[PDB]
């Protein structure tokens, strides 16, 4: 039912609500402090400057059911072919394949932009997220113990990556 | 002698940094920087409370340097830093690498950090071995994530847990 489209500034309150819910309730984002609309507007502006997409999964009423974006992975010019993405689905919208729809769409954008590699950073216990990525062609590249903390406990990080143009032998 | 870097060390640090930009896969930047660029980098580290150390003689000439900073820009990663160590090209095979990394590790410990991460171009067998010698373990292997000299480069992550008896943050 839901459609995937580019985000506008009017989607930012719905984006913020999803972001802050993950902050409060999950390991999907390793921050414990919630942010305000201005912070997400600054994030939106950053993506605009970079020319990177922000996509939303939306319903008829314009409710944000999920969103996805990518940014730079490491801050050096040698990494310009590589981006790190994030995909968030509203908690009540889980189990409907929206994460797949969002990530499929984001991959197609990344390809159209001539990018080389998409990197996912996933908390290692999040089997749902790992499986979603695996089924879209991502491979495990790293497993990094105790690099994070949240809820008073150490967290491990799994890196997965997708090469978007495996035939491109040279940059 | 290993000591904290001062402003006087920046020309020595600049020369080493630019050498690495031009001649190595140690920095995945291909464009040389000016002194002002390193001055800003120095000030940012100072303001963050992160160390910049220099391998120096009593006269003060910079034989190598080392620093660490944020690995990922989220509060959840506050126990984790990413380091770099650079030794002047004419000073290789003299134990300066071990010296600097050992000193950086001691500083990270004193600051109560939990994990130090190295990002190493995968073909750099010497640097991978140096890190293994100081108890780093491979924790990531990432094909073609970067480029330099007109070719794709692979990246190896290695990490050291600074306090593995600390069951909780």
mmCIF file of C-alpha atoms in Angstrom:
data_model
loop_
_atom_site.group_PDB
_atom_site.id
_atom_site.type_symbol
_atom_site.label_atom_id
_atom_site.label_comp_id
_atom_site.label_asym_id
_atom_site.label_seq_id
_atom_site.Cartn_x
_atom_site.Cartn_y
_atom_site.Cartn_z
ATOM 1 C CA UNK A 1 0.000 0.000 0.000
ATOM 2 C CA UNK A 2 2.695 2.485 1.131
ATOM 3 C CA UNK A 3 4.575 4.557 -1.470
ATOM 4 C CA UNK A 4 8.305 5.369 -1.443
ATOM 5 C CA UNK A 5 9.104 9.005 -2.313
ATOM 6 C CA UNK A 6 11.649 11.734 -1.566
ATOM 7 C CA UNK A 7 11.233 13.451 1.790
ATOM 8 C CA UNK A 8 10.267 17.102 2.148
ATOM 9 C CA UNK A 9 10.544 19.456 5.128
ATOM 10 C CA UNK A 10 6.915 18.561 5.957
ATOM 11 C CA UNK A 11 8.006 14.944 6.592
ATOM 12 C CA UNK A 12 10.477 16.053 9.263
ATOM 13 C CA UNK A 13 8.069 15.850 12.233
ATOM 14 C CA UNK A 14 7.256 12.202 11.271
ATOM 15 C CA UNK A 15 10.941 11.466 10.723
ATOM 16 C CA UNK A 16 11.766 13.022 14.124
ATOM 17 C CA UNK A 17 9.156 10.882 15.911
ATOM 18 C CA UNK A 18 10.674 7.682 14.412
ATOM 19 C CA UNK A 19 14.218 8.863 15.167
ATOM 20 C CA UNK A 20 13.396 9.684 18.809
ATOM 21 C CA UNK A 21 11.524 6.389 19.328
ATOM 22 C CA UNK A 22 14.635 4.438 18.186
ATOM 23 C CA UNK A 23 16.766 6.647 20.460
ATOM 24 C CA UNK A 24 14.531 5.838 23.441
ATOM 25 C CA UNK A 25 13.687 2.209 22.767
ATOM 26 C CA UNK A 26 16.173 0.395 20.544
ATOM 27 C CA UNK A 27 19.808 -0.259 19.604
ATOM 28 C CA UNK A 28 19.177 1.015 16.055
ATOM 29 C CA UNK A 29 20.708 4.323 17.044
ATOM 30 C CA UNK A 30 23.514 4.521 19.628
ATOM 31 C CA UNK A 31 22.401 7.821 21.124
ATOM 32 C CA UNK A 32 20.323 8.120 24.294
ATOM 33 C CA UNK A 33 19.530 11.852 23.984
ATOM 34 C CA UNK A 34 16.486 12.836 21.887
ATOM 35 C CA UNK A 35 16.804 15.609 19.290
ATOM 36 C CA UNK A 36 14.562 18.472 18.212
ATOM 37 C CA UNK A 37 13.048 19.431 14.857
ATOM 38 C CA UNK A 38 15.869 21.959 14.261
ATOM 39 C CA UNK A 39 18.457 19.170 14.594
ATOM 40 C CA UNK A 40 16.661 17.051 11.965
ATOM 41 C CA UNK A 41 16.282 20.127 9.743
ATOM 42 C CA UNK A 42 20.082 20.545 9.979
ATOM 43 C CA UNK A 43 20.467 16.849 9.024
ATOM 44 C CA UNK A 44 18.059 17.361 6.080
ATOM 45 C CA UNK A 45 20.145 20.402 4.977
ATOM 46 C CA UNK A 46 23.364 18.372 5.245
ATOM 47 C CA UNK A 47 21.949 15.671 2.915
ATOM 48 C CA UNK A 48 20.782 18.452 0.551
ATOM 49 C CA UNK A 49 24.332 19.906 0.440
ATOM 50 C CA UNK A 50 25.754 16.432 -0.201
ATOM 51 C CA UNK A 51 23.149 15.695 -2.884
ATOM 52 C CA UNK A 52 22.213 12.501 -1.035
ATOM 53 C CA UNK A 53 18.591 11.297 -0.912
ATOM 54 C CA UNK A 54 16.241 11.002 2.018
ATOM 55 C CA UNK A 55 13.318 8.714 1.222
ATOM 56 C CA UNK A 56 10.128 8.112 3.167
ATOM 57 C CA UNK A 57 7.589 5.304 3.166
ATOM 58 C CA UNK A 58 4.322 7.210 3.287
ATOM 59 C CA UNK A 59 0.595 6.530 3.477
ATOM 60 C CA UNK A 60 -2.386 8.452 2.076
ATOM 61 C CA UNK A 61 -2.548 10.916 5.017
ATOM 62 C CA UNK A 62 1.175 11.602 4.559
ATOM 63 C CA UNK A 63 2.122 9.739 7.741
ATOM 64 C CA UNK A 64 5.799 8.754 7.715
ATOM 65 C CA UNK A 65 5.830 4.954 8.167
ATOM 66 C CA UNK A 66 9.604 4.698 7.713
ATOM 67 C CA UNK A 67 12.568 6.489 6.177
ATOM 68 C CA UNK A 68 16.004 5.860 4.683
ATOM 69 C CA UNK A 69 19.063 7.878 3.757
ATOM 70 C CA UNK A 70 22.788 7.595 3.217
ATOM 71 C CA UNK A 71 25.751 9.796 4.009
ATOM 72 C CA UNK A 72 29.527 9.647 3.949
ATOM 73 C CA UNK A 73 31.124 6.672 5.674
ATOM 74 C CA UNK A 74 34.625 8.033 6.364
ATOM 75 C CA UNK A 75 35.617 11.756 6.025
ATOM 76 C CA UNK A 76 38.438 11.445 3.474
ATOM 77 C CA UNK A 77 38.352 12.019 -0.306
ATOM 78 C CA UNK A 78 39.576 8.441 -0.961
ATOM 79 C CA UNK A 79 36.211 7.188 0.362
ATOM 80 C CA UNK A 80 34.017 9.126 -2.097
ATOM 81 C CA UNK A 81 32.710 5.860 -3.679
ATOM 82 C CA UNK A 82 31.389 4.580 -0.339
ATOM 83 C CA UNK A 83 28.323 5.659 1.615
ATOM 84 C CA UNK A 84 26.766 4.440 4.833
ATOM 85 C CA UNK A 85 23.011 4.117 4.855
ATOM 86 C CA UNK A 86 20.345 3.973 7.561
ATOM 87 C CA UNK A 87 16.775 2.625 7.344
ATOM 88 C CA UNK A 88 14.143 3.107 10.051
ATOM 89 C CA UNK A 89 10.650 1.617 10.139
ATOM 90 C CA UNK A 90 8.010 2.892 12.574
ATOM 91 C CA UNK A 91 7.599 0.276 15.309
ATOM 92 C CA UNK A 92 3.916 -0.489 14.493
ATOM 93 C CA UNK A 93 4.826 -0.919 10.808
ATOM 94 C CA UNK A 94 7.302 -3.749 11.402
ATOM 95 C CA UNK A 95 6.699 -7.103 9.684
ATOM 96 C CA UNK A 96 5.257 -5.597 6.503
ATOM 97 C CA UNK A 97 8.350 -5.567 4.258
ATOM 98 C CA UNK A 98 8.701 -1.750 4.405
ATOM 99 C CA UNK A 99 12.406 -1.946 5.313
ATOM 100 C CA UNK A 100 12.968 -3.980 2.140
ATOM 101 C CA UNK A 101 11.027 -1.474 -0.007
ATOM 102 C CA UNK A 102 13.002 1.422 1.447
ATOM 103 C CA UNK A 103 16.396 -0.214 1.048
ATOM 104 C CA UNK A 104 15.633 -1.463 -2.466
ATOM 105 C CA UNK A 105 14.779 2.125 -3.420
ATOM 106 C CA UNK A 106 17.908 3.520 -1.760
ATOM 107 C CA UNK A 107 20.143 1.001 -3.599
ATOM 108 C CA UNK A 108 18.626 2.118 -6.921
ATOM 109 C CA UNK A 109 19.362 5.775 -6.046
ATOM 110 C CA UNK A 110 22.940 4.920 -5.038
ATOM 111 C CA UNK A 111 23.444 3.155 -8.389
ATOM 112 C CA UNK A 112 21.979 6.088 -10.332
ATOM 113 C CA UNK A 113 24.499 8.331 -8.508
ATOM 114 C CA UNK A 114 27.456 6.202 -9.634
ATOM 115 C CA UNK A 115 28.389 5.142 -6.084
ATOM 116 C CA UNK A 116 30.543 2.026 -5.561
ATOM 117 C CA UNK A 117 29.808 0.549 -2.104
ATOM 118 C CA UNK A 118 27.004 0.848 0.487
ATOM 119 C CA UNK A 119 27.960 0.104 4.103
ATOM 120 C CA UNK A 120 25.506 -0.919 6.885
ATOM 121 C CA UNK A 121 26.416 -0.693 10.589
ATOM 122 C CA UNK A 122 24.087 -2.946 12.536
ATOM 123 C CA UNK A 123 24.055 -3.876 16.211
ATOM 124 C CA UNK A 124 25.179 -7.532 16.093
ATOM 125 C CA UNK A 125 22.157 -8.910 18.004
ATOM 126 C CA UNK A 126 19.724 -7.426 15.479
ATOM 127 C CA UNK A 127 19.132 -10.604 13.461
ATOM 128 C CA UNK A 128 16.127 -9.046 11.727
ATOM 129 C CA UNK A 129 18.299 -6.271 10.244
ATOM 130 C CA UNK A 130 21.196 -8.581 9.361
ATOM 131 C CA UNK A 131 18.785 -10.913 7.500
ATOM 132 C CA UNK A 132 17.108 -8.061 5.647
ATOM 133 C CA UNK A 133 20.505 -6.890 4.385
ATOM 134 C CA UNK A 134 21.754 -10.411 3.544
ATOM 135 C CA UNK A 135 18.672 -11.004 1.379
ATOM 136 C CA UNK A 136 19.452 -7.823 -0.595
ATOM 137 C CA UNK A 137 23.047 -8.902 -1.368
ATOM 138 C CA UNK A 138 24.957 -7.440 1.601
ATOM 139 C CA UNK A 139 27.850 -9.454 3.030
ATOM 140 C CA UNK A 140 29.280 -9.406 6.583
ATOM 141 C CA UNK A 141 32.605 -7.535 6.523
ATOM 142 C CA UNK A 142 33.237 -6.847 10.184
ATOM 143 C CA UNK A 143 32.301 -7.810 13.699
ATOM 144 C CA UNK A 144 33.557 -5.407 16.314
ATOM 145 C CA UNK A 145 33.007 -6.294 20.033
ATOM 146 C CA UNK A 146 32.224 -3.733 22.737
ATOM 147 C CA UNK A 147 32.712 -0.665 20.519
ATOM 148 C CA UNK A 148 29.393 0.776 21.712
ATOM 149 C CA UNK A 149 27.367 1.186 24.866
ATOM 150 C CA UNK A 150 23.696 1.763 25.557
ATOM 151 C CA UNK A 151 21.310 0.945 28.399
ATOM 152 C CA UNK A 152 24.345 0.416 30.660
ATOM 153 C CA UNK A 153 25.728 -2.449 28.546
ATOM 154 C CA UNK A 154 28.467 -3.000 25.915
ATOM 155 C CA UNK A 155 27.236 -3.399 22.315
ATOM 156 C CA UNK A 156 28.890 -5.094 19.348
ATOM 157 C CA UNK A 157 28.753 -3.727 15.818
ATOM 158 C CA UNK A 158 28.478 -5.690 12.589
ATOM 159 C CA UNK A 159 29.523 -4.082 9.321
ATOM 160 C CA UNK A 160 27.950 -5.361 6.105
ATOM 161 C CA UNK A 161 28.554 -4.076 2.577
ATOM 162 C CA UNK A 162 27.098 -4.191 -0.923
ATOM 163 C CA UNK A 163 29.243 -3.523 -3.969
ATOM 164 C CA UNK A 164 26.951 -1.682 -6.354
ATOM 165 C CA UNK A 165 29.035 -2.220 -9.500
ATOM 166 C CA UNK A 166 31.174 -5.333 -9.043
ATOM 167 C CA UNK A 167 32.278 -5.132 -12.720
ATOM 168 C CA UNK A 168 33.905 -1.670 -12.259
ATOM 169 C CA UNK A 169 37.460 -2.969 -11.919
ATOM 170 C CA UNK A 170 39.011 0.485 -11.426
ATOM 171 C CA UNK A 171 37.795 3.883 -10.151
ATOM 172 C CA UNK B 1 61.790 10.707 23.448
ATOM 173 C CA UNK B 2 57.961 10.550 23.318
ATOM 174 C CA UNK B 3 56.181 13.726 24.471
ATOM 175 C CA UNK B 4 53.022 15.750 23.860
ATOM 176 C CA UNK B 5 53.145 17.761 20.631
ATOM 177 C CA UNK B 6 53.493 21.514 20.863
ATOM 178 C CA UNK B 7 52.764 24.193 18.273
ATOM 179 C CA UNK B 8 56.523 24.182 17.435
ATOM 180 C CA UNK B 9 56.167 20.576 16.194
ATOM 181 C CA UNK B 10 53.590 21.417 13.495
ATOM 182 C CA UNK B 11 56.084 22.024 10.626
ATOM 183 C CA UNK B 12 57.670 18.624 11.386
ATOM 184 C CA UNK B 13 54.198 17.002 11.547
ATOM 185 C CA UNK B 14 53.167 18.744 8.295
ATOM 186 C CA UNK B 15 56.164 17.338 6.407
ATOM 187 C CA UNK B 16 55.434 13.781 7.594
ATOM 188 C CA UNK B 17 51.699 14.097 6.829
ATOM 189 C CA UNK B 18 52.413 15.420 3.299
ATOM 190 C CA UNK B 19 55.008 12.668 2.719
ATOM 191 C CA UNK B 20 52.343 10.082 3.601
ATOM 192 C CA UNK B 21 49.739 11.788 1.338
ATOM 193 C CA UNK B 22 52.135 11.693 -1.607
ATOM 194 C CA UNK B 23 53.910 8.389 -1.198
ATOM 195 C CA UNK B 24 51.816 5.931 0.797
ATOM 196 C CA UNK B 25 48.416 4.378 1.350
ATOM 197 C CA UNK B 26 48.541 5.574 5.028
ATOM 198 C CA UNK B 27 46.232 8.519 4.343
ATOM 199 C CA UNK B 28 43.535 8.155 1.656
ATOM 200 C CA UNK B 29 43.865 11.754 0.614
ATOM 201 C CA UNK B 30 45.828 12.631 -2.528
ATOM 202 C CA UNK B 31 46.043 16.393 -2.052
ATOM 203 C CA UNK B 32 48.831 17.942 0.099
ATOM 204 C CA UNK B 33 47.832 20.359 2.861
ATOM 205 C CA UNK B 34 49.237 23.624 4.183
ATOM 206 C CA UNK B 35 50.395 24.394 7.734
ATOM 207 C CA UNK B 36 47.010 26.038 8.506
ATOM 208 C CA UNK B 37 45.288 22.723 7.775
ATOM 209 C CA UNK B 38 47.445 20.932 10.370
ATOM 210 C CA UNK B 39 47.052 23.892 12.760
ATOM 211 C CA UNK B 40 43.253 23.452 12.652
ATOM 212 C CA UNK B 41 43.613 19.690 13.129
ATOM 213 C CA UNK B 42 45.880 20.314 16.133
ATOM 214 C CA UNK B 43 43.434 22.804 17.683
ATOM 215 C CA UNK B 44 40.460 20.446 17.179
ATOM 216 C CA UNK B 45 42.265 17.597 18.989
ATOM 217 C CA UNK B 46 43.327 19.923 21.807
ATOM 218 C CA UNK B 47 39.725 21.138 22.191
ATOM 219 C CA UNK B 48 38.477 17.538 22.246
ATOM 220 C CA UNK B 49 41.045 16.603 24.919
ATOM 221 C CA UNK B 50 42.661 13.986 22.674
ATOM 222 C CA UNK B 51 46.439 13.536 22.621
ATOM 223 C CA UNK B 52 48.920 14.316 19.833
ATOM 224 C CA UNK B 53 52.270 12.750 20.659
ATOM 225 C CA UNK B 54 55.595 13.211 18.940
ATOM 226 C CA UNK B 55 58.674 10.998 18.740
ATOM 227 C CA UNK B 56 61.387 13.611 19.183
ATOM 228 C CA UNK B 57 65.006 14.071 20.185
ATOM 229 C CA UNK B 58 66.221 16.604 22.779
ATOM 230 C CA UNK B 59 66.840 19.129 19.963
ATOM 231 C CA UNK B 60 63.175 18.781 19.000
ATOM 232 C CA UNK B 61 63.063 17.429 15.445
ATOM 233 C CA UNK B 62 59.909 15.383 14.689
ATOM 234 C CA UNK B 63 60.710 11.730 13.885
ATOM 235 C CA UNK B 64 57.088 10.597 13.990
ATOM 236 C CA UNK B 65 53.758 11.349 15.557
ATOM 237 C CA UNK B 66 50.585 9.734 16.773
ATOM 238 C CA UNK B 67 47.092 10.762 17.772
ATOM 239 C CA UNK B 68 43.584 9.443 18.241
ATOM 240 C CA UNK B 69 40.110 10.911 17.786
ATOM 241 C CA UNK B 70 36.446 9.971 17.462
ATOM 242 C CA UNK B 71 35.752 6.773 15.529
ATOM 243 C CA UNK B 72 31.999 7.284 14.937
ATOM 244 C CA UNK B 73 30.060 10.539 15.683
ATOM 245 C CA UNK B 74 27.542 9.161 18.193
ATOM 246 C CA UNK B 75 27.535 9.395 21.996
ATOM 247 C CA UNK B 76 27.242 5.567 22.135
ATOM 248 C CA UNK B 77 30.809 5.288 20.772
ATOM 249 C CA UNK B 78 32.411 7.495 23.454
ATOM 250 C CA UNK B 79 34.487 4.581 24.781
ATOM 251 C CA UNK B 80 35.982 4.009 21.318
ATOM 252 C CA UNK B 81 38.707 5.962 19.536
ATOM 253 C CA UNK B 82 40.495 5.608 16.204
ATOM 254 C CA UNK B 83 44.260 6.198 16.201
ATOM 255 C CA UNK B 84 46.918 6.993 13.603
ATOM 256 C CA UNK B 85 50.700 6.567 13.857
ATOM 257 C CA UNK B 86 53.148 8.028 11.315
ATOM 258 C CA UNK B 87 56.913 7.560 11.302
ATOM 259 C CA UNK B 88 59.216 9.707 9.152
ATOM 260 C CA UNK B 89 60.348 7.747 6.093
ATOM 261 C CA UNK B 90 64.062 7.919 7.017
ATOM 262 C CA UNK B 91 63.264 6.637 10.536
ATOM 263 C CA UNK B 92 61.628 3.278 9.694
ATOM 264 C CA UNK B 93 62.697 -0.013 11.340
ATOM 265 C CA UNK B 94 63.901 1.732 14.504
ATOM 266 C CA UNK B 95 61.088 0.740 16.888
ATOM 267 C CA UNK B 96 59.501 4.208 16.779
ATOM 268 C CA UNK B 97 56.147 2.749 15.655
ATOM 269 C CA UNK B 98 55.960 0.442 18.678
ATOM 270 C CA UNK B 99 57.111 3.308 20.973
ATOM 271 C CA UNK B 100 54.440 5.744 19.768
ATOM 272 C CA UNK B 101 51.587 3.210 19.763
ATOM 273 C CA UNK B 102 52.538 1.962 23.253
ATOM 274 C CA UNK B 103 52.491 5.595 24.490
ATOM 275 C CA UNK B 104 49.130 6.292 22.842
ATOM 276 C CA UNK B 105 47.693 3.129 24.430
ATOM 277 C CA UNK B 106 48.863 4.251 27.887
ATOM 278 C CA UNK B 107 47.184 7.641 27.328
ATOM 279 C CA UNK B 108 43.916 6.038 26.183
ATOM 280 C CA UNK B 109 43.957 3.840 29.302
ATOM 281 C CA UNK B 110 44.580 6.855 31.567
ATOM 282 C CA UNK B 111 41.599 8.588 29.900
ATOM 283 C CA UNK B 112 39.419 5.565 30.733
ATOM 284 C CA UNK B 113 38.689 4.574 27.136
ATOM 285 C CA UNK B 114 37.573 1.048 26.242
ATOM 286 C CA UNK B 115 38.562 0.248 22.617
ATOM 287 C CA UNK B 116 41.204 1.594 20.201
ATOM 288 C CA UNK B 117 40.550 1.016 16.488
ATOM 289 C CA UNK B 118 43.118 1.067 13.641
ATOM 290 C CA UNK B 119 42.082 1.442 9.967
ATOM 291 C CA UNK B 120 44.879 -0.053 7.874
ATOM 292 C CA UNK B 121 45.190 -0.383 4.086
ATOM 293 C CA UNK B 122 45.039 -4.180 3.757
ATOM 294 C CA UNK B 123 48.255 -4.671 1.713
ATOM 295 C CA UNK B 124 50.234 -2.911 4.459
ATOM 296 C CA UNK B 125 51.623 -6.097 6.047
ATOM 297 C CA UNK B 126 54.159 -4.179 8.207
ATOM 298 C CA UNK B 127 51.474 -2.059 9.862
ATOM 299 C CA UNK B 128 49.153 -5.047 10.370
ATOM 300 C CA UNK B 129 52.090 -6.896 12.025
ATOM 301 C CA UNK B 130 53.024 -3.894 14.204
ATOM 302 C CA UNK B 131 49.462 -3.784 15.512
ATOM 303 C CA UNK B 132 49.295 -7.556 16.076
ATOM 304 C CA UNK B 133 52.458 -7.185 18.173
ATOM 305 C CA UNK B 134 50.633 -4.726 20.471
ATOM 306 C CA UNK B 135 47.644 -7.045 20.911
ATOM 307 C CA UNK B 136 45.311 -5.688 18.207
ATOM 308 C CA UNK B 137 43.016 -8.210 16.497
ATOM 309 C CA UNK B 138 41.440 -8.054 13.036
ATOM 310 C CA UNK B 139 37.750 -7.143 13.362
ATOM 311 C CA UNK B 140 36.889 -5.872 9.847
ATOM 312 C CA UNK B 141 37.929 -6.589 6.248
ATOM 313 C CA UNK B 142 36.343 -4.302 3.675
ATOM 314 C CA UNK B 143 37.001 -4.743 -0.068
ATOM 315 C CA UNK B 144 37.284 -1.763 -2.432
ATOM 316 C CA UNK B 145 35.873 0.778 0.055
ATOM 317 C CA UNK B 146 38.474 3.354 -0.902
ATOM 318 C CA UNK B 147 40.640 4.546 -3.749
ATOM 319 C CA UNK B 148 44.094 6.053 -4.215
ATOM 320 C CA UNK B 149 46.600 6.229 -7.082
ATOM 321 C CA UNK B 150 43.764 5.336 -9.489
ATOM 322 C CA UNK B 151 43.013 1.905 -7.943
ATOM 323 C CA UNK B 152 40.514 0.432 -5.443
ATOM 324 C CA UNK B 153 41.944 -0.210 -1.976
ATOM 325 C CA UNK B 154 40.759 -2.597 0.732
ATOM 326 C CA UNK B 155 40.609 -1.635 4.408
ATOM 327 C CA UNK B 156 41.358 -3.750 7.477
ATOM 328 C CA UNK B 157 39.973 -2.794 10.887
ATOM 329 C CA UNK B 158 41.922 -3.940 13.947
ATOM 330 C CA UNK B 159 40.969 -3.285 17.541
ATOM 331 C CA UNK B 160 42.363 -3.443 21.052
ATOM 332 C CA UNK B 161 40.180 -3.725 24.143
ATOM 333 C CA UNK B 162 41.874 -1.517 26.740
ATOM 334 C CA UNK B 163 40.032 -2.949 29.754
ATOM 335 C CA UNK B 164 38.441 -6.342 29.114
ATOM 336 C CA UNK B 165 37.719 -6.922 32.838
ATOM 337 C CA UNK B 166 35.241 -4.015 32.661
ATOM 338 C CA UNK B 167 32.041 -6.061 32.265
ATOM 339 C CA UNK B 168 29.914 -2.920 31.862
ATOM 340 C CA UNK B 169 30.444 0.737 30.855
#
